[PDB]
Design a protein around this ligand. Sequence first.
Ligand SMILES: Nc1nc2c(ncn2[C@@H]2O[C@H](COP(=O)(O)OP(=O)(O)O)[C@@H](O)[C@H]2O)c(=O)[nH]1
Ligand SMILES: *SCCCNC(=O)c1cnn(-c2ccc(OC)cc2)c1C(F)(F)F
Ligand SMILES: [Mg+2]
Length: 168
Amino acid sequence: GMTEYKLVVVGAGGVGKSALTIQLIQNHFVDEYDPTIEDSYRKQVVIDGETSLLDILDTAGEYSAMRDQYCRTGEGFLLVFAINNTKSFEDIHHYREQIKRVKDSEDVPMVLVGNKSDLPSRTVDTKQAQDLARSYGIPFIETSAKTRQGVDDAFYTLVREIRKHKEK
Ligand SMILES: Nc1nc2c(ncn2[C@@H]2O[C@H](COP(=O)(O)OP(=O)(O)O)[C@@H](O)[C@H]2O)c(=O)[nH]1
Ligand SMILES: *SCCCNC(=O)c1cnn(-c2ccc(OC)cc2)c1C(F)(F)F
Ligand SMILES: [Mg+2]
């Protein structure tokens, strides 16, 4: 059989939300994608042997109508920052707090994603990010949309978090 999952990719503009999404759906790094495009994209993958239809909202900086739909009904959220942009890391909590204010339950599947791991000019270190993730009770995954490192882990881990929540 199959299962469908509604995922929402959030975070500051310029962190690589579109690049991560396009790696997952098209299997390559697209380095120029209009920063203002906010849209949903469907992709079928196989996760732990199960056909999984992912319905992914890639959010822009600006806020489209779909955004409220997917905030309301979204089953899991990728909180994305870039490891070379401290401001994007500091923005994470605003997004997490808003998701929590919208939802009824406090147990909302989320993964913290630190993107652009290929760049040498790091300003947020993995210890800082793991400490934030631990304070939220969620996984931290380091990614490079450019090389694909960690990208599949980030999305598949989020699906696994959703599955755990659905079992309750
Ligand atoms: N080096 C590197 N550049 C990236 C990575 N992900 C995104 N970019 C670049 O970062 C900028 C913003 O990416 P984009 O996908 O448009 O971010 P969004 O605004 O979060 O959707 C673009 O210039 C991308 O080429 C990455 O993992 N590594
Ligand atoms: S699914 C819920 C998320 C959708 N996006 C927002 O709600 C949003 C848009 N802008 N912000 C935001 C950014 C920075 C800030 O302080 C510097 C406050 C708000 C958000 C929010 F973070 F609230 F989610
Ligand atoms: Mg984008």
